[PDB]
Structure 1
Amino acid sequence: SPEDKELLEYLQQTKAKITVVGCGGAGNNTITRLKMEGIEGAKTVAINTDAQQLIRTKADKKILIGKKLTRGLGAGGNPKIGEEAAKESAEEIKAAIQDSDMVFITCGLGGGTGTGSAPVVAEISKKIGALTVAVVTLPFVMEGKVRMKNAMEGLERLKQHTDTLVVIPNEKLFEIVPNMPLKLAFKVADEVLINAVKGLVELITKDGLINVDFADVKAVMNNGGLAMIGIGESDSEKRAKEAVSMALNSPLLDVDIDGATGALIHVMGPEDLTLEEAREVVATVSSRLDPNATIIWGATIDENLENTVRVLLVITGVQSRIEFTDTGLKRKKL
């Protein structure tokens, strides 16, 4: 029977179905790059309340949300509209992430479409029973108080309908290249973003020097509460050791990780990458979290990655370590 045959086939699926949804201009901007630089095994869905941005975007599926609310003309920086536009198009959004086993909601918090629609796309995803993960940034302080109070509130809302929520405070990007002209500001942030997102998807989707079990990912990530990134990499010949300290020290991991469970580690390096450098990476890390943290890791080889090995680090469940003030992420004072 065509139903039995279909059933049989189902059992043969070997790969997890990952869909990436970018919201608003920045999120669409991100989707456009993954769609070009390629995002190993993942479909891209861009959703915007602004038709012009949506149109100049490159994605697998485009959805103009808020068609009656907005008119294809933007949400004017208003999270309330981003939200209704998304609520108004729930069906359509859900129909795009419907078959995904895992869904990543990415965007720049602070605007109206992203800040308002991300929590909506997230709650819709959770309903269809998918692994809901958000890799989202916080505005630069230069952008002002209203942009951040809005970003904060969005983060809070996004917290409730998210399995794991990865926050990247653009402000620390300045702790990485101190005298950056706002120009690069958003170009650096663009980079960090595409890394955090691609680093995570491939860690789960790209064949490495280890089989990384989606069932494990789902296990851990199912409870990443509030996670934070760490990126590091060494040109030198003591790579692993330097790439993981860089990472463990990135100003992006702006949190006290001592009391942290779960972690996802992706070491990427050239063909001369060793399962041992990977392990070095993993233990230097394991050595700093709760003694029982569940750690997911993988190791992939990157063509264009010269003599270097990057080390993406996603430390989860740090929400008790942080303070959600409507002025930003404040490292908790107990």
Structure 2
Amino acid sequence: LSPEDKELLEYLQQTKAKITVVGCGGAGNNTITRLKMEGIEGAKTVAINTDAQQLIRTKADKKILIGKKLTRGLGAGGNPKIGEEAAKESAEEIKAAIQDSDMVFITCGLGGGTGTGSAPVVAEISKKIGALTVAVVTLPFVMEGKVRMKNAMEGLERLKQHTDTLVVIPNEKLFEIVPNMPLKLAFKVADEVLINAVKGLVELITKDGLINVDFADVKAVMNNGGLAMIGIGESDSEKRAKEAVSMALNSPLLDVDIDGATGALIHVMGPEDLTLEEAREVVATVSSRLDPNATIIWGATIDENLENTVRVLLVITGVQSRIEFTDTGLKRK
């Protein structure tokens, strides 16, 4: 290289796109494990919990047992305050774990004591170190009781204070996707949605695809994405790309008016025969449903575990004005 170049390269050296995914509580830890085992691209995984037993059986690049002096390696028993105090107690360790991150993904299942309580603390620390802070969390099933939904919503309120974009997935809507779903499989299905949402969002930024997704653009949109929701769809039919995005746009997980949506992140995933043309048809379809001033970031990657099905992950941001926070869950305005 040359004097100018060599300098630049060195510059690229220091700077980067350090992404860290943090899972809190059992649900959060279970998510991290899958990401680690199936190997999420260009992202560090961190699992944190008060329950040492859940944490020891968890797999991640780093593990932080929080609340040692407070919970003595035991869970929070559903007490959000314990999870908060515990996270506060381990603020330094958490900070060390996510230090130097350009972006931090906080994932957990709201409703318990650790995830609900610690998540907002990890988020605050994440912002203090200057990382684009994004959370992907789930709301509990109705069958879990009002108390769980209350703590969840309360935690969703605290969380919204420290995040740049807060993606919320209502588990209850999972029953609308698969009506005859056996109870013993509810959480196995939720696991799948969570993984597809987090991995899908992360790899959209880190995985080489048929088109380049710029990190600066991703910042611009997530920096103030506010409250966000997702849509998932896949098809192998004649118009696979057309059906997939149609499914995603009609997904019950995306329970809200998207016309006022400020932006969107679209991740098209398919087998080796995936073409840029299909990707564009997906974007075009979504583009018409949102405000013409909305910013749309999109990518398209090959997933060899797809055979001949195309998958579409939709993330609609800035929809908090079309939503209201009740202790029974989110309600459409």
Is 1:163–1:225's contact at 8 Å kept on the other side of the alignment? yes
Ranges in structure 2 where 5+ consecutive residues have no aligned partner = none
Residues 164 and 227 in structure 1, CA contact (< 8 A), matched pair in contact too? yes
CA distance 1:5–1:115, shift in 2 (3 Å): farther
Q: How far is 1:306 from its partner?
A: 1.0
Of stretches 169-178 and 234-243 in structure 1, the one that deviates more from structure 2 is 234-243
Q: Which moved more, 1:15-24 or 1:198-207?
A: 15-24
Task: For 2:324 and 2:50, locate their aligned partners in 1 and report how far apart those are by CA, in whole Å.
Answer: 31
The verdict on how the C-alpha distance between 1:297 and 1:3 changes in structure 2, with shifts beyond 3 A counting, is closer
Query: Does residue 179 of structure 1 match 2:177?
Result: no
3-state DSSP class of the match of 1:53?
helix
Equivalent in the alignment of 2:210: 209
Give deviations 1:275-305, integer Å, cap 9, x for gaps. Answer: 1110100010010111110000000001010
In the TM superposition, residue 3 of structure 1 has moved relative to its aligned partner by: 18
- Deviation of 1:11 after TM superposition, in Å, equals 2.6
Residues in 2 aligned to 1:252 and 1:196: alpha-carbon distance in whole angstroms? 11
Q: What secondary structure is seen at the aligned counterpart in 2 of 1:257? A: coil
TM-score (norm 1): 0.96
How does the TM-score come out when normalised to structure 2?
0.96
- TM superposition shift of 1:237: 2.0
Rate the CA distance shift 1:112–1:265 in 2: closer, same or farther, 3 A.
same
Q: CA deviation at 1:9?
A: 3.0
Q: How far apart in 1 are the matches of 2:56 and 2:89?
A: 20
Query: SS at 1:12's partner residue?
Result: helix
Per-residue CA deviation, residues 219-264 of structure 1 (Å, 9 max, x unaligned), is 1011111000000011112111101100000000001001111100
Percent identical residues: 100
Give the count of matched residue pairs: 331
Contact 1:231 1:247 in 2 (8 A): yes
- Native 8 Å contact 1:15 1:205 kept in 2: no
Q: Which of structure 1's runs of 4+ aligned residues deviate more than 2 A? A: 1-15
- Cα distance in 2 between the residues matched to 1:294 and 1:15: 24
- Name the CA shift for 1:182/1:2 in 2 (closer, same or farther; >3 Å): farther
| Kept in 2: contact 1:136–1:166 (CA 8 A) | yes
User: Alpha-carbon deviation of 1:10?
Assistant: 4.2
Q: 1:295 to 1:4 in 2, by over 3 A?
A: closer
Deviation at 1:16, TM superposition (A): 1.0
Secondary structure at the counterpart of residue 304 of structure 1: helix
User: How far apart are 1:4 and its partner, in Å?
Assistant: 15
Q: Specify whether residues 14 and 203 from structure 1 end up closer, same or farther in structure 2 by C-alpha distance, changes over 3 A only.
A: farther
Unaligned runs of at least 5 residues, structure 1 = none
